[PDB]
Design a protein around this ligand. Structure first.
Ligand SMILES: *[B@]1([O])O[C]([C][N]C2=[C][C]=C(C([N])=[N])[C]=[C]2)[C]C2=[C][C]=[C][C]=C21
Length: 222
């Protein structure tokens, strides 16, 4: 997460840390006591979901860990374009809910216009290093049109754009599948964007969570 600051330890109960081969691969959102939402490109062997995490370097009294029973990738994911970049992870055990582990409600209405949002994660920072402490950034919902010029012919009804004009706060490698929270509701998931990370000109591209209400429910109820 570029041009951000360390998060308030209490402001991210819904945050998931996805691990593979012993290193942080992705982010995720606890959306149900048994389910983590993430990006589909995060499908890597033997995923280990860590909930209630703040510092990845230290062991914490609030941390909980779980293996993945099932990883459900949207049937229409196109890895070349990131179209339908959504995955559902069935936790081995229903997560021990506390004040530091809580599900986050998803924004079902595609109409909703709370441009005032934020990103969070453990992706590579401005110094080029992976932070042990989770990074935050307040950002705004960038226009369909600006994305249509920043990214020529690479935006669909399944993608949302977000960024900050003044500082250029953006998501980066390691933040994949992390939440875009708007009005205390999940609006999107870190999918892709610009290199090097920075939303000055070219914003960050996110998965459009509202487009997947019926898919998520039909996968949770299966
Ligand atoms: B993952 O964490 O990172 C890459 C994609 N990285 C990325 C994310 C956001 C932005 C942005 N907003 N400018 C740019 C680049 C893909 C990936 C693949 C497998 C596992 C994890 C990731």
């Amino acid at each position: 997460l570029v041009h951000g600051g360390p998060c308030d330890k209490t402001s991210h109960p819904y945050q998931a840390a996805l691990y593979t081969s012993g290193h942080l691969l992705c982010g995720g959102v606890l959306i149900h006591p048994l389910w983590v939402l993430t990006a589909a490109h995060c499908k890597k062997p033997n995923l280990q979901v860590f909930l209630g995490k703040h510092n990845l370097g230290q062991q914490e009294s609030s941390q909980e860990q779980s293996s993945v029973v099932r990883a459900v990738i949207h049937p229409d994911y196109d890895a070349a374009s990131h179209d339908q970049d959504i995955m559902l992870l069935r936790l081995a055990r229903p997560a021990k809910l506390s004040e530091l582990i809580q599900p986050l409600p998803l924004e079902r209405d595609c109409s909703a216009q709370t441009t005032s949002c934020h990103i969070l994660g453990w992706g590579k920072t401005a110094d080029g290093d992976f932070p042990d402490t989770i990074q935050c950034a307040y950002i705004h919902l960038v226009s369909r049109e600006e994305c249509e010029h920043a990214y020529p012919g690479q935006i669909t009804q399944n993608m949302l754009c977000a960024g900050d004009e003044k500082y250029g706060k953006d998501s980066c490698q390691g933040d994949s599948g992390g939440p875009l929270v708007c009005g205390d509701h999940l609006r999107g998931l870190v999918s892709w964007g610009n290199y090097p990370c920075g939303s000055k000109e070219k914003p960050g591209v996110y998965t459009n969570v509202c487009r997947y209400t019926n898919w998520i429910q039909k996968t949770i109820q299966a």
